[PDB]
């Protein structure tokens, strides 16, 4: 099964860590918890942002251009990316925008963090059609000393 995991500001705005105004160590912990020991598929800008492989996960980078780092697996198409994951219970797609758009129709699960922040940006999480999904988990947290904004973890499953 294929899942997407993303952090969304108001109006579904998303972006690279350097672009976004929030600091949410609790969300990073949520991301790690839900991706550890699973393959992760990301686009090239997301790879450039993390700077090194995510530990404890098979790192697969989807790009039309040749790889430039032999520490990770490079693929040129959605089908190649899925094949590179082999036989696993769950594949985690970790963005960014174009990658989310390419995998959404194949996905059966979404892990979303809804952040209470208004952010200017051109990149958005794809319009998922809410009535096609069932909300199976929701957990709200206020901002605190460590976390800059309030946020809500949600898991949705495709009907």
């Amino acid at each position: 099964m294929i899942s997407l995991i993303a952090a969304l500001a108001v109006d579904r705005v998303i972006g690279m860590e350097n672009a976004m105004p929030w600091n949410l160590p609790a969300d990073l912990a949520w991301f790690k918890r839900n991706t550890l020991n699973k393959p992760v598929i990301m686009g090239r800008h997301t790879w450039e942002s993390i700077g090194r492989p995510l530990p404890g996960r098979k790192n697969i980078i989807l790009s039309s251009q040749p790889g430039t780092d032999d520490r990770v697996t490079w693929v040129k198409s959605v089908d190649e990316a899925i094949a590179a994951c082999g036989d696993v219970p769950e594949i985690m797609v970790i963005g960014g925008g174009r990658v989310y758009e390419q995998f959404l129709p194949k996905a059966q699960k979404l892990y979303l963090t809804h952040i209470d922040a208004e952010v200017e940006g051109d990149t958005h999480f794809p319009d998922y059609e809410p009535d096609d999904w069932e909300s199976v988990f929701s957990e709200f947290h206020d901002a605190d000393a460590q976390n800059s904004h309030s946020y809500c973890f949600e898991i949705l499953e495709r009907r």
Partner: nanobody, 127 residues
Framework: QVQLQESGGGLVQAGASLRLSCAASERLTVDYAIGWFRQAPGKEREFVAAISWGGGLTVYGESVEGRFTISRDIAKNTMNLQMNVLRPEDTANYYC????????????????????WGRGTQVTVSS
């Protein structure tokens, strides 16, 4: 490429302050971070401070936390490092860098993974 141009280095006494500046020749995009590393004679280069260009969020090396403050101005396309309560062991060549690597990772990333560098500015702190 975009050039990183450093200024502000000099010689001051222990306990004084000094302000370094790094101006990028072309406007940075929101996905970049910009920051400082330093290298003292005979020592390995080490991380000092970084700020995300879009978010304006900061991180510091353990040896300068509390004493140094990094900031950036979007309009002037410049970043500044205000260095206070300087110590002799802060003496080094200071280098500005920029990269798409998340600012949060700069305290542990190998410095050569950053692809944009200034040429270095000398800071000397004497007792």
């Amino acid at each position: 490429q975009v050039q990183l141009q450093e200024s502000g280095g000099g010689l001051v006494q222990a306990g004084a302050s000094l302000r370094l500046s790094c101006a990028a020749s072309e406007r940075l995009t929101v996905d970049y971070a910009i920051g400082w590393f330093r290298q003292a004679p005979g020592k390995e280069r080490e991380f000092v401070a970084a700020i995300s260009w879009g978010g304006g969020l900061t991180v510091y090396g353990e040896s300068v936390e509390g004493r140094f403050t990094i900031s950036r101005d979007i309009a002037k396309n410049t970043m500044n490092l205000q260095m206070n309560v300087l110590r002799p062991e802060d003496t080094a060549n200071y280098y500005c860098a920029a990269s798409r690597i998340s600012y949060r990772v700069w305290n542990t990333i190998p410095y050569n993974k950053l692809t944009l560098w200034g040429r270095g500015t000398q800071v000397t702190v004497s007792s």
